Symmetry: C2
C-alpha cells in the first residue's frame, strides 16, 4: 500500500513523498480549502516506476484506480463516462518547487462521446468542448506527440481567418471543429494512434509521462544545476477539474502574496476571465493584474486575500497560488512558497521578522544561500543609461539590467558562450526546452507574457533578468532578426533592464540593509571564520567590505609574472649556478616586499595566508620564438641555448610535475626570496603602523612530512634571519596545502611540521578523481547526460570521494596537533554545501573568491544554524 | 556659592552647569582617572558674566581663587610662584562638544621669574621654557592679541635659519630666545602691555576671554547653525598641567575608540612624542598614528586601551580623549563622545546594539537627526574617477568625494556661493576664523594636518569632506594659486575624495544596512506618518524609496507652466468670457489627467494631497516684450492689448494678492478643470489597475470658512459630476492650507467644510513674522549678527510665534472635527525639531522634500521616542 496518498490522508511534512505540491495541497486540505478533492501519486512510486523497467504496474495502476474510484463516488461524477462525465487535471508535484519546468494535463478523462455528453450535462457545448480542444493540445504536448507549433498554428489560424477577436468568442461549432482538426493534428504527427480516447488511457498515458519525463534532458540539466538529485522523484497529484473556462464569470489566475522581484508586501499577479489555468495566464491575451479582481469580481477578492493571507501565515513565507473561479466559485488548485529573486528573498525575510512571523534564525536558513551572487551583478551606469537610445518598454518581469549580443534561440544563445559573452535572448515565448538558453543569457525579452509567464518566473530563480509581454517586437527567426521602435536588430549587443526599458556601461552595486540584516545575523549564528583568496589588495579592500575576515590564500605567482618582475626569474631559470639564481632571486626581493606591504597595509591585523610559489619554471618562460629572440639577446645567451633550456622544462603533465614545494627543494632560494619579502614587509609594516602582523606562510603541494620539513627548515632560518630589524618578536606559522592524496593521507604525520592545514580542493579533487578540470571538459557533459556525475566535481564538493581525504586529514592532524587550524581554499570554498560540509567537517576558516564571501557568510550561517 | 565646581564635587549629569567637558571630566574623576585634579568654572557663572556688564566679579574671582587654592595645597605647588611654580591649563567646557571651536590656554601661571624657577625645579630649562614659549603664543592667541602669523613666523624662522630639523631640538638658550623675542612679538602688536606676568592676570585675563569670546562672530555663526543657543554658556575647567613636552618619553595624543569616518571599531588617532597637546598634534610634524604607541611605548598602550575601553563602555558611545604621557605617566586631559560622520554615526550604533551596549531605542535618539542628509550626497561616478587625472593623495580625513572651483580663503570661499557652486578650499591649515568658509565648501584640502587636525575634525560634523596633511602643495596666496603633482591651479574646479585621492561626474548613492536598521527601527518607534511634497513621479519613486508614505502636497503649478500647457491659460487670462476661459481650461483637461495618472500609477494606494493652483495669473504671462510679441500674434490680439492685460495683472505684493483659493472664486473654472483632471485620472487609474485611490483635494490660502465653502461647493459638484465613469463610489476629502493667520485663527470654524488641515509654514511664517523669505535676506544676517533671531525662520520652526497659529488650529479644528487629520508641508516639514514640535503638536502626517524624508523618519522616531 501507500503508493499513492490522499490529500486529506497526508500533510505537508510528508514531502519526501508528497512533494512541495502534493503535501502543501493536502495541507490546505487539512486546513479546509477551496480545493476540489483528489489524490496524489507518491514519490517512492515514481522512483519505483524506474526501479523496475520503465512502465507502470500493479499496486500503482491498482491504486490510481483504487482511489480514482474514491474520487468518482466522493465526486458522484463518472471517470470518462461518455454521458455525464468526470474530468480531472493531471499535474507534477515533485519535492522542490520548479516553476517553469513542470507537467499538468488539463480537463482529462474526456472524449468525443463524453465531451458531447458533457456538452448536454454542462448545458454548454462551447465550454466542455473548448475544454476538449484544450485537453487535446495538453495531453499530447506534455506526453510530447506534437510540437505546440501545430495546435498553436491551428487555433491561431482558425480565428486568424474567421475574424474572431480572440479565442474567447469561438463557438461550439468552430471549437468542436478546432478540437476536430486537433485530433488529426495529433494524428498526422503521429503514425495513427487514437488520441487516447479511453480515460484509462489518457491517464496512465500521462501519469507515466510524468513519472517518465523527469529522467529526460532538460529536467536533468535544470534539476541538476538546481541542486536537486535524480534520487528523488516526480509526483502527480490528480484531482477533479475546476473550469475557469466555463464562461464570462469563471476565471483563471496566478498570484503571489508579496512582490517577488522587489519583496513588496502585497498581492502580486496575473488573471484571466474565462481562461484555462495552466495555459492562457502563462501566455496569449494580456492577463488582468490580480488587483483588478476588485473592479471585476468584488466578492471574489475578499475570498482569495483573506484566504491568501490565512495561507501566507499558515506557512510563514511568501505564498504563490493557482486560484480559479470555476464559474463564480473560488478554487486553489495549487500553492508553494514561490522561489524569489535575491533581493526579494531578502526583503521578505527582513519583513517577515519585522512582522513577527519568522525568527532571526528562521530568516537565515530560509534564504537560498547560493542566490546571494545576484546582489553583486554589474548594475548599469546612470550616465550611460540616459545616454542609452530608448527604443522600447514593457515589463518589470525580473530585476536586473543586462546587455549583450542578441539571440532568438536558446541553442544559439548557449552555443554563444554562457552568461557573460553577453547573450540576449529575444523569444516569442520561452519553454522548458529553452532551459539551457535561459542559464547562459544576461537577461530575456519576451513578446508574449507577464510576471506569471514561463520565462519570467524562471528568470527570477535564475536571477536572470527578464522583460516579458514585450509587444511591438516584429521578430523574424528565418532571417535571424527582430524589430522594435524604429530599429532593425541583427544578433548584436542589446540592452534590457529590471526597470521596464529595453535600451550600456555597468558597475559595482549597492547592498541594502537587507544584506546587512541578513549578513548581520549570519555572523551571529555562524562559527567558521571567512577569508577571501586574494592577491591584489584592491580585492582585499572590496572583500573586507563583504565581511571578510582576512586572507585564506595569497598567490605569489604574479609576484614574478608581473610586467617588471618577469625577466628576473626567467633569468634565474636560464641560469646555471645558485649564486646566480640567488642574485636573480635577490632582485625580486624588493618588489614582492611592496606587494606584501600593500596587502598588509590593506588587511590591518586581518590574517593572511601566503601560499608559496606554485607553477613550475615552464610557466615562467616565453613559449614563443619571438619573446625567446628577445630573452636570449638580453641574456647574452643563444636563442638556441634558451630553447634547449626551455626544452628541459617540459612536463608531460604540468599538474603532477616539478612545482610548488618540490620546486623550492632544488632552489630553496625561492623559499629564501619568498620568506624574506614577506618577512621584511610584515616587519617594516608592523613598524610604520604599530599594528600586528603574523605571517601565515604556505607551502603548497606538500606530499609528505619530511619534505615540508626541508622547506620549513629553510623558510624558518631566513625568517629568523630576516629578524635583523630587531632581534624581533615577529610571528609566523608555516602551514601546508593538504591538496594531494598521500598528504591528506599521512596527515597525522604531516601535521608534525605544520600549524595549519590548508585545503586545496580543486587540485585535490583533480587527484582524487583522476581527471583534470581542463581536460575533463571534453567528456564531463556525458557524465551529466549519462547521469554518472550529478554535480560539477570542480564546483560542488565530492563528499563521497574527496570529502574523505579532507576528513582523514582534519581529524588526524588534530591527533598530533590539536590546536590545528584548518581552512578551505578550493573553488568549493564558498559553496552553500561545502561551507556546510566544511562546517560539520571540522574546518576553522573559509576562503572564497572576493564575491563568493557573502555566500560564505550565509553558508556558514546556514552551516551551523540548521545543522543541529 | 556654586559658581564653580570641583571635578570630584560634580558629575556628568550636571551638564547644564559642567558642560560636556567639565562634567565628563569629573565623571572620569568619579570613576578614578589619570586626570590631574582641578576645577570647573560653571556655566551659570558664564552667563552671569554677561547678565551684568561684561567683566568678572566677586564670588567668581573669589571662587577662582577660593578653589585655585584648594588646588595649590591639594597639589602642593604654588600658583605662579616664581621659585617652584604651579602651572595650569585653561580650556573651554561648554555643554555641547565643539571640536574645532574651542579655547585652551596651556602651561599657565608662568613668568620670566617662575619659568627659571621651574627651570631649576624642573632640572630642565629646555622644558619649562619651551613650555613658556608655549604659553606666550597661546594666552595671547586665544585672548587674541596677536595673529599666530607672528609667533609662527618667529618659531618657524628661528629654526628656519639655524638649521634645527624641528622645534624638538631647539635648546634652552634658543627657546628662551624664542619666548624672549615672543613677549616683544606680543609687545609690538600691542600698545605696550606686559604679557600678563602676574598669574592673577593671565588667568582672569583668559577665563574672561573664555566667558567672553563665545558672544563673538564665528562662535555665534557656528553655535547658531549647530543648533545651539546663546542662552547657554562657556565653561572653563581649570586644572593642573601635565607636560607631553617634558622630553623624549612624554607625549601628547588625540584619539577615538572607533573610526569616526567609517565607524570601524578600533583605536583611531594621532600622537606626538614630546609635544604639546593642544598645538602640535592638531598641526606641524606628522603625528604618530596612535597604534604605533605599541612600538613606541609598549607599556603605555595597555594603559590607554583598557582605559579607553573602560570609558568606551562607561558612556556606551564612541569616545574621544586627550591623553598625555607627561613623562612616562598617562593623563586623560579630556573626553567627550566625539561627533561623527553620517555613516559612522550609524555604524557605531548598529554595532553598539550588536555589541549589546545600546538598545534599539537608545541607538535611534543617539543619532544626530539632521545628519542623515549626508547619506544622500552626490557620489562620484566610477567611470569618470578613473578618467580623473590623478595628481595627488593624502588623507582619508572625512568621507565624501567633492569637487569644484578652488579657493585659498574661507572668505573667498563663502563669497563664492554656499556648498554647491562648488567651492574647494585649499588651505595651509584651517581655523576657527574659517568656520564660514567651512560651511560653504564641498570638501577641503589641508597641507598640514591629520585625522585630529582643526579642519578634519570639523568637516566630519559638517559632513564636509576633507583631506588634511596633504603635503607637496606649493600654494601661493598672493598670486591666488597652488601646486600639486605637476599642475598649476588658478581658482577653478578641483576634485577631492574620502578615498585619499585629490583628482568629476556625480550620482545617487547607496544606503547600507545601517540606514536600514536605523530606518527600520525609526518606523518602529515613530508615530507620525511621512509623505513627500512632490510634483513629479520621478521623485515619487525615489521618495517612496526612502520610506515615504505618500504625498503631503502635490503642486499643479507646472501643470500649466510646462512646455505645452503654457499658452492655454495664457489664453484663458487674455480672454474676457467664462466660456472662453472654460474652453481654455477644458483644453488643459486632458493634460493634467495624465500627470495625475503617472503620479497615481506611481503611488499605488499611497495617499496624495493635491494642492490647488497657487500663483496668481501674473506668474502665468510673459514679462518680456518678446514672448509678448509672440503671444499677441497667436491670440489675434494687439501686443498692446496683452501688455495692458499683463498690466491689470500687477500686484504691489504678489504674496498677499489675487491667488490660490481666491483665484478660483472668480474663475471657479480653475476649480473645475482641476477637480476633473484629478477626478478622471484617479477614476480611470482606479479602473485600469483595480487599485484604490482617494483624492485628497487641496484648497490653499483659505482665509476663512465661507470662502472654502465657495470652492468646495464647486469642486464637489464637479467631482460628483465627474463620477460619470460609473455612478461611482469614488473617494475624496477636500482639505485646506492653514497657511494664513485668520485661517489658523478661526480654525475651529474653518474645519467645518474641511477634513484635513494642511499646514503651510514657510507661507505662514512669512505672515506671522512680517517679512518675506525673499526680501528679508537683505537684513536677516543682521538679526543673526545682532542675535535677534537665532535660528532661520524659514528653516527652523518659530515655536514661540508661528507655533501658536498652528496649535490653535490643530486643537480647535479638532473641536469641530475630531477625526481631523493634520499634516505639515512647509520647508520645516522635515526638521529634527519641527518633526518633534509637529509630533508633540498633534499633527498626523509629515511632508518634506523627497530627500529630507529620511530626516523625517528619524525625526519622528526621535520625536515620540525620547518625547515621553
Amino acid at each position: 500500500a501507500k503508493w499513492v496518498y490522499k490529500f486529506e490522508e497526508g500533510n505537508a511534512s510528508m514531502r519526501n513523498l508528497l512533494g512541495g505540491a502534493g503535501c502543501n495541497l493536502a495541507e490546505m486540505t487539512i486546513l479546509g480549502m477551496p480545493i476540489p478533492q483528489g489524490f496524489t501519486v507518491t514519490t517512492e512510486a515514481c522512483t519505483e516506476y524506474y526501479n523496475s523497467g520503465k512502465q507502470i504496474t500493479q499496486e500503482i495502476q491498482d491504486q490510481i484506480f483504487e482511489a480514482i474510484t474514491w474520487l468518482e463516488e466522493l465526486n458522484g461524477k463518472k471517470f470518462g463516462d461518455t454521458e455525464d462525465p468526470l474530468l480531472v487535471s493531471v499535474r507534477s508535484g515533485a519535492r522542490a518547487s520548479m516553476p517553469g519546468m513542470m507537467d499538468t494535463i488539463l480537463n482529462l478523462g474526456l472524449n468525443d462521446v463524453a465531451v458531447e455528453g458533457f456538452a448536454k450535462k454542462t448545458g454548454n457545448p462551447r465550454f466542455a468542448y473548448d475544454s476538449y480542444r484544450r485537453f487535446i493540445q495538453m495531453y499530447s504536448d506534455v506526453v510530447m506527440e506534437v510540437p505546440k507549433s501545430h495546435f498553436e498554428k491551428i487555433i491561431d489560424a482558425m480565428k486568424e481567418e474567421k475574424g474572431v477577436h480572440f479565442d474567447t468568442d469561438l463557438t461550439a461549432d468552430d471549437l468542436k471543429e478546432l478540437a476536430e482538426k486537433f485530433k488529426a493534428v495529433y494524428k498526422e504527427a503521429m503514425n495513427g494512434e487514437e488520441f487516447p480516447q479511453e480515460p484509462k488511457d489518457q491517464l496512465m498515458g500521462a501519469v507515466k509521462a510524468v513519472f517518465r519525463s523527469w529522467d529526460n534532458p532538460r529536467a536533468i540539466v535544470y534539476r541538476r544545476m538546481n541542486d536537486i538529485p535524480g534520487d528523488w522523484g516526480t509526483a502527480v497529484n490528480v484531482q477533479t477539474m475546476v473550469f475557469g473556462n466555463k464562461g464570462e464569470t469563471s476565471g483563471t489566475g496566478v498570484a503571489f502574496t508579496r512582490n517577488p522581484s522587489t519583496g513588496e508586501k502585497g498581492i502580486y499577479g496575473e488573471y484571466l476571465i474565462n481562461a484555462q489555468g495552466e495555459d492562457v495566464v502563462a501566455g496569449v491575451r494580456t492577463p488582468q493584474p490580480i488587483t483588478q479582481l476588485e473592479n471585476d469580481m468584488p466578492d471574489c477578492y475578499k475570498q482569495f486575500m483573506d484566504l491568501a493571507m490565512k495561507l501566507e501565515k499558515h506557512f510563514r513565507d511568501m505564498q504563490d497560488m493557482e486560484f480559479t473561479i470555476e464559474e463564480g466559485k473560488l478554487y486553489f488548485l495549487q500553492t508553494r512558497n514561490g522561489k524569489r529573486t535575491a533581493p526579494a528573498a531578502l526583503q521578505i525575510a527582513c519583513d517577515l521578522v519585522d512582522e513577527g512571523m519568522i525568527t532571526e534564525e528562521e530568516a537565515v536558513v530560509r534564504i537560498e544561500a547560493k542566490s546571494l551572487d545576484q546582489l553583486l551583478h554589474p548594475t548599469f551606469n546612470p550616465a550611460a543609461l540616459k545616454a542609452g537610445e530608448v527604443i522600447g518598454s514593457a515589463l518589470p518581469a525580473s530585476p536586473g539590467a543586462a546587455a549583450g549580443k542578441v539571440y532568438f534561440t536558446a541553442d544559439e544563445a548557449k552555443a554563444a558562450h554562457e552568461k557573460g559573452e553577453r547573450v540576449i535572448l529575444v523569444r516569442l515565448e520561452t519553454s522548458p526546452e529553452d532551459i539551457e538558453g535561459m542559464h547562459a543569457a544576461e537577461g530575456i525579452l519576451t513578446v508574449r507574457g507577464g510576471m506569471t509567464s514561463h520565462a519570467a518566473v524562471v528568470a527570477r530563480g535564475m536571477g536572470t533578468c527578464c522583460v516579458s509581454g514585450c509587444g511591438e517586437i516584429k521578430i523574424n527567426e528565418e532571417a535571424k532578426t527582430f524589430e522594435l521602435g524604429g530599429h532593425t536588430f541583427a544578433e548584436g549587443d542589446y540592452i534590457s533592464l529590471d526597470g521596464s526599458t529595453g535600451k550600456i556601461e555597468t558597475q559595482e552595486a549597492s547592498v541594502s540593509g537587507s544584506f546587512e540584516r541578513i549578513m548581520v545575523w549570519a555572523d551571529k549564528f555562524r562559527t567558521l571564520k571567512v577569508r577571501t583568496n586574494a592577491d591584489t589588495p584592491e580585492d582585499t579592500l572590496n572583500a573586507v567590505k563583504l565581511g571578510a575576515e582576512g586572507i585564506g590564500l595569497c598567490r605569489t605567482e604574479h609576484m614574478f609574472f608581473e610586467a617588471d618582475r618577469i625577466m628576473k626569474i626567467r633569468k634565474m631559470i636560464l641560469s646555471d649556478s645558485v649564486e646566480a639564481r640567488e642574485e636573480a632571486l635577490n632582485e625580486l626581493i624588493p618588489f614582492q616586499k611592496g606587494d606584501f606591504k600593500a596587502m598588509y597595509k590593506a588587511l590591518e591585523g586581518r590574517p593572511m595566508t601566503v601560499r608559496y610559489l606554485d607553477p613550475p619554471l615552464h610557466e615562467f618562460v616565453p613559449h614563443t620564438e619571438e619573446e625567446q629572440a628577445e630573452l636570449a639577446k638580453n641574456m647574452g645567451l643563444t636563442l638556441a641555448e634558451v630553447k634547449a633550456k626551455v626544452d628541459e622544462l617540459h612536463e608531460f603533465n604540468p599538474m603532477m610535475g616539478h612545482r610548488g614545494c618540490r620546486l623550492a627543494v632544488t632552489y630553496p632560494e625561492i623559499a629564501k626570496m619568498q620568506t624574506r619579502a614577506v618577512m621584511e614587509a610584515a616587519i617594516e609594516v608592523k613598524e610604520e603602523t604599530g599594528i600586528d602582523i603574523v605571517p601565515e606562510i604556505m607551502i603548497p603541494l606538500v606530499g609528505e612530512k619530511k619534505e615540508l620539513k626541508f622547506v620549513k627548515d629553510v623558510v624558518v632560518e631566513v625568517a629568523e634571519q630576516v629578524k635583523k630589524e630587531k632581534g624581533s618578536d615577529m610571528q609566523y606559522h608555516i602551514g601546508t596545502m593538504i591538496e594531494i592524496p598521500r598528504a591528506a593521507l599521512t596527515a597525522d604525520a604531516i601535521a608534525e611540521e605544520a600549524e595549519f592545514f590548508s585545503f586545496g580542493t580543486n587540485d585535490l579533487t583533480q587527484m582524487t578523481f583522476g581527471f583534470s578540470r581542463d581536460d575533463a571538459g571534453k567528456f564531463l557533459d556525458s557524465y551529466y547526460k549519462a547521469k554518472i556525475y550529478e554535480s560539477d566535481p570542480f564546483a560542488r564538493l565530492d563528499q563521497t570521494g574527496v570529502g574523505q581525504l579532507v576528513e582523514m586529514a582534519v581529524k588526524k592532524g588534530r591527533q598530533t596537533r590539536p590546536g590545528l587550524k584548518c581552512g578551505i581554499c578550493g573553488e568549493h570554498g564558498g559553496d552553500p554545501s561545502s561551507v556546510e560540509f566544511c562546517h560539520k567537517v571540522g574546518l576553522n576558516y573559509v576562503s572564497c573568491s572576493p564575491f563568493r564571501v557573502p555566500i560564505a557568510r550565509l553558508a556558514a550561517a546556514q552551516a551551523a544554524l540548521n545543522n543541529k
